[PDB]
Design a protein around this ligand. Sequence first.
Ligand SMILES: CCCCNC(=O)[C@@H]1C[C@H]1[C@]12COC[C@H]1CSC(N)=N2
Length: 393
Amino acid sequence: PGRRGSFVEMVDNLRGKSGQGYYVEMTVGSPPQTLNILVDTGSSNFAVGAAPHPFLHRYYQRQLSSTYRDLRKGVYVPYTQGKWEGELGTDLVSIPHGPNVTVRANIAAITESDKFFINGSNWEGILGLAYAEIARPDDSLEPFFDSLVKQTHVPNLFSLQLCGAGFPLNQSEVLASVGGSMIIGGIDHSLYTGSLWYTPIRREWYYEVIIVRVEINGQDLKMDCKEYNYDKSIVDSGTTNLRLPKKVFEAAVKSIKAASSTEKFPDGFWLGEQLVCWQAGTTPWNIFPVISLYLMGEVTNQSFRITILPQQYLRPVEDVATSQDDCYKFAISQSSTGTVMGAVIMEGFYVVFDRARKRIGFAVSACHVHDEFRTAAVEGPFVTLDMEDCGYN
Ligand SMILES: CCCCNC(=O)[C@@H]1C[C@H]1[C@]12COC[C@H]1CSC(N)=N2
């Protein structure tokens, strides 16, 4: 049967890019205040700018909302690279290009921040879509999606199609361009090709999954599979890169260098710091390998694989000079906090966060960037033993 798209109201409701994030329009308060909000599957707080900042064009004004409720509690949120503090409260929240519902949700009103708001990102707050376990200050602060499901008939599922352009966009071009879809409460069949394959959510905190095998151009990286999930593996729309645990990063980079060895790249490129450029149109995609991550399947002793191209893991960037060159950064980098399947990975795939069934679905995205010779893939099944042993305790 031909694929029908059943959620037209929500298709094309995202804007942005992998480097700065993908965001959805939301409203907060009465009367509604419109804000652009980062879609973040790697955290669990709804947190919005609530005071002037050089990089905010607008912010939540609690004093103008008749429905604002003060929870009389502060929150201090330090990250590795950035921090903010704010004040907890609740208010009525809607998503204009979303389900036609309004819910009362927790909001962290951000009053001070450092290196959080990004100059030119276009978003004024973040929607943490992960579970209560990792909410701040503690798990009693109900996340947005939990509130939405509890207060409405919206099914306990959302799905994300993040659409990378495959070339740079400036702030203006991001504003004018569609960057993908967040389908709240369903799966839109127009957004993917081939089959959806599902991996279990190992535990409801992050969206944690288990990787059971890694290949570079079909060659097994051949590490003990626990290494791939040390100390966890998560799916995170709020991280740019594919991040890999240090030892896995070292082994993968060695293999990717060997596969691409017909051209020598400087250390700064492999470290994700320095851009590389080619004359317009001549990017040598074919010298770079595909990367396959095998995920635990839902059936005992079965796995499936997702395969990405260099069109996913090479992130388009503007030249530091003035040129018509096509330039990129290497968007795989090291982690000391486990594997992070970030935006550049998610751009390959339609990703179904099936909370109801405690599983994450992957299918090839209808908007993934590719060439005439190769496409991203989602394929299975494979016979794979002892997959639970790949999980780190
Ligand atoms: C692709 C977007 C790039 C910029 N990302 C952010 O600003 C993320 C909103 C933060 C946080 C909020 O908790 C930690 C912090 C870093 S990792 C994460 N998933 N979320």
